[PDB]
């Protein structure tokens, strides 16, 4: 019963399926597209401080720890495929890397970054892929 | 159950399939073809600094750690075939070599190298081959 | 023979001695002080490329992998003290963190960063401290 | 050789010595005293964004992960004393709590909080105490 | 299950198949035929230095570590057949000899040798043979 | 009998003693200082080829495999100190790195590199230091 | 499973098949027949030195280590048959003798011997026989 | 499985078959018949030295170590039959005696003996018999 | 009784003592100095052949297997010091390298090489050093 | 009781003492000096045969198996010193080489070789040295 030669295939199909989208960029936001599709509007209270105005509670997701640097992330995918996922420590470490990569960039009192882009953990298209991936690491032996 | 006499054949078919393309050059870019097909345009801000202008987020891949020296890479292939892939350490070491060979040459504030060439990890034709290879090293015993 | 209750004291005295200087800033350089004390002069060859002019070979050290982000580094010190250095894995992991933190920011064809600061591994005052520290992690049991 | 009945006394003397100062408040900063003694000056660039102006590199410490909520922190001390520090897991868990409590409140592009207070890990008086404490948890058996 | 009496036959058929071509010379180049079929043109920049002009990236293979002395190589074949390939150390050592024999003779700034010949690892006819050989050494017991 | 806590100190004193000189540059040569102090004179035979004229046999050392990239070398020293030299594999691997780093840059028919610098294994001052270092790795347990 | 009573017959049939040809002389060359059939022409450069002129690379085989003294060789065959090839050491030693007997007599700057004869390892008729022989020694038990 | 009661019969049939011919003399040569059938002609160069003139290379066999004293040889046969060939040491010792008995009498610069006779190992009729004999000694147990 | 920590020092002192002289060149000969100090005179018999005239038997040493390429040799010394001479295989392998490096360049019918240099095993100054070295490898455990 | 670290020194002192004389040539004879000091006179009986005339029985030594090729012999000394004489097989094999090297060149009916030299086992000066050497190999463990 080598279940961990099926899991190795599942983990790899999962990393590839994610890469296909990261390459096209899909799920990457800048100050403009973030505020446009989230609906959060920045009001420029003085002096150098400000804040977003929450109109519905659904927007609290956008302000959670859901953002990753598009380069740092795509690099995890590059190095991930160069691992022995027959072993446990591999599956346990890289999985943690695909869980902690998402940190928070936008806050109620911290406007979305000026020029950089970010990748949205809960983006409609990436969400299922980053899920399946994190879940394919979850095998026993 | 000698699965590691099938893996040895798979790892070798994988290295050969990659070499066939590396020989034809395909996947090798210079300053000209890199900027032409990525769409990144270098604007010569003074004095000796400058930067690329990102028009879509898909271009962030090109600026990741995806570039390898065409000679250093083809040399890995040459020496790779001279290994005992019946053994684990072989499969684990050379695999790491085909994962770490890709380092970043182009950056937002570091223009693609002047005269050298580089090999693109995510090139349409090389991508599946460098994948399959890295994944054929992933066997248990 | 508990040598690893003397090493725990040595590793901690080492982290504190380093922190005392990191706090005062000493060993932190910006584009201005880097070029001033290294003697490297940036000549603005067009268009957005350029390079430093090496006048003596001693300057090659400055262009090696000797630079760390002052915040990322001081954070290692903060979290380091919160470890069980009675254990091996502690001593082996954080030691690796104080070795890999130094990456290269300045290159012959990549001018020192515009506005950021960096910490110099071989700075006259930090050098002995980052050494002693890395060496205090080197205990057997 | 019960060394862990001396460590239990050392860990407790350490928590008490820290509490004595936390009670007096010493080491607690608000927007005013933070900017006054760090020397960081907030310039109100529009619209609702801004930044601190770094005059010396020593100030990078203030912008690291060195701040804890004065209440959350004093509560750790309250509950800490209610532990069995004869056991390992105690010493290993609460120690981690006195290491992770320090998170970053002030950033170059994120002005010190408006009205709240924070406790400074590297405050002249608290520094030695939070050190000794974290280090008294580091015992073997 | 004596698989290593089939491998001994495979390793020997492989060495013979290679020798048949080495004898006819095929795969041996001199300054003239190297530059003729690679397309690399040597431009005589003064004074005693010069370089090849790369017109396509495919030529980078020719400048890799792919060249062996025709005599040194044919001698490996002579002595190879005088080994006990029933044993492991044999298969592991001579295999390494057929991997390291290829060193680099031509470089971008080092013109192909004046009068000597060299054998090209990636020559259309030798390539499959030197491959199969190196791969026939890869057996377990 | 812990001899490998004396060897760890010896290996570290050895790496530091070497670094002190690498920092000052001493032992680094360019085309000019190499030809000046070796006495080798490049005669520009046409067209893009040439050669050095050997006047005494002592010069054959300069043309051996004695040259290392000053940056690659100083980087070995940086990462070396971040190792557990209590262990064997450490002492055996980094030692090999300080032995193989020296490759040959100057050849009788290959003029010293145009603009780069190189470090000379047998330089009067570095020689004893690179020796002692390589020899301090040679301990049993 | 006595495979080494079949190998003893194979090794003996192999030595006899070789002797049949050595007796007829076939595969023996003198200065005249060597230069006639190899195509190598000796040009008498002064004073007592000279060299062969290579017209095709196939001739490099003739200048390798492929020549044995016809008497020394036929004597190996005589004494070989007087061995216990049921034993390993026999098969391993005499095999080495039929591999090392071939040394190089003709060199690019060393004209084929004046009056002596030599036996050519790669002679069209001897080649398969000296092969089969060397390969019949390769048995396990 | 008593294979060494079949080998004892084979070794004895072999010694008898050889004796039948040794008795008739066949395979015995004197200066006259040696030079007549070998074709080697002795030219009497002064003073007391001389040499044979080789017209074809096939004659080198005659000048190898192929000659035995007809009496010494027939005596080996006499005493051989008085051995216990059920034992190993017997088969291994007498076999060596039928291999070493052949020493060289005729040399290029040493004319065939004046009056004595010699037995020719490679004589058309003796050759197969001395072979079969030497090979019948080659049994395992 | 660690005798193999004294032998490691002896082997290293031996390699250094040899290097000191190899660096100065001493013991290196070209066609001119070889014939001058050996007394062997090359007489240019036609056409492209010739020979040395032996006047005393002492000169037979010069024509033995006593010559090594000055670069190949000095490289052995470079890599030698990068070995674990605490281990046996080290001492046994490199020792063999310092024994086999000496091959024969000059022969009675093969004039000393035209332009190259060679190192003389029996040179008055090198002789004792190459001896002591080879003999310092000869230790038991 | 390591007697085989005294024997290793004795075997080496023995090889060196022999080499000192072989280098000076002493003990090397040609047709002229052999016949001069042995007193054997060659009478040129026709046609190409002849013989020495024995005047005293002491001359029978000169005609025994006491002659070695000066080059083959000095080469044994060269390679001998490159052995592990701590081991038995070394001492047993090279000893056999210094015993079998002496073969017979001069015979009553075979005049001393025309132009070659030979080394005389029983030469007044070499005799004690070749003895001591052969006897220093004779140690137990």
UniProtKB/Swiss-Prot annotation, chains A, B, C, D, E, F, G, H, I, J:
Superkingdom field: Viruses
Cellular component GO terms, alphabetical: helical viral capsid
Range of residues in the leader sequence: none
GO molecular function: identical protein binding; structural molecule activity
Main location as per UniProt: virion
Residues bearing PTM N-acetylserine: 51
Function: Capsid protein self-assembles to form rod-shaped virions about 18 nm in diameter with a central canal enclosing the viral genomic RNA.
Protein's name according to its UniProt entry: Capsid protein
The organism of origin for this protein: Tobacco mosaic virus (strain vulgare)
């Amino acid at each position: 019963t080598r279940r961990v030669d099926d899991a190795t295939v599942a983990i790899r199909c999962a990393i590839n399926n994610l890469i296909v989208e990261l390459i096209r960029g899909t799920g990457s936001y800048n100050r403009s597209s973030f505020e446009s599709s989230s609906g959060l509007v920045w009001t420029s209270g003085p002096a150098g401080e400000g804040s977003y105005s929450i109109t519905t509670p659904s927007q609290f997701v956008f302000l959670s720890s859901a953002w990753a640097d598009p380069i740092e992330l795509i690099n995890l995918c590059t190095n991930a495929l160069g691992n022995q996922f027959q072993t446990q420590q591999a599956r346990t470490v890289v999985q943690r890397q695909f869980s902690e990569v998402w940190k928070p960039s936008p806050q109620v009192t911290v406007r979305f970054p000026d020029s950089d882009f970010k990748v949205y953990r809960y983006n409609a298209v990436l969400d299922p892929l980053v899920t399946a991936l994190l879940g394919a690491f979850d095998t026993r032996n």
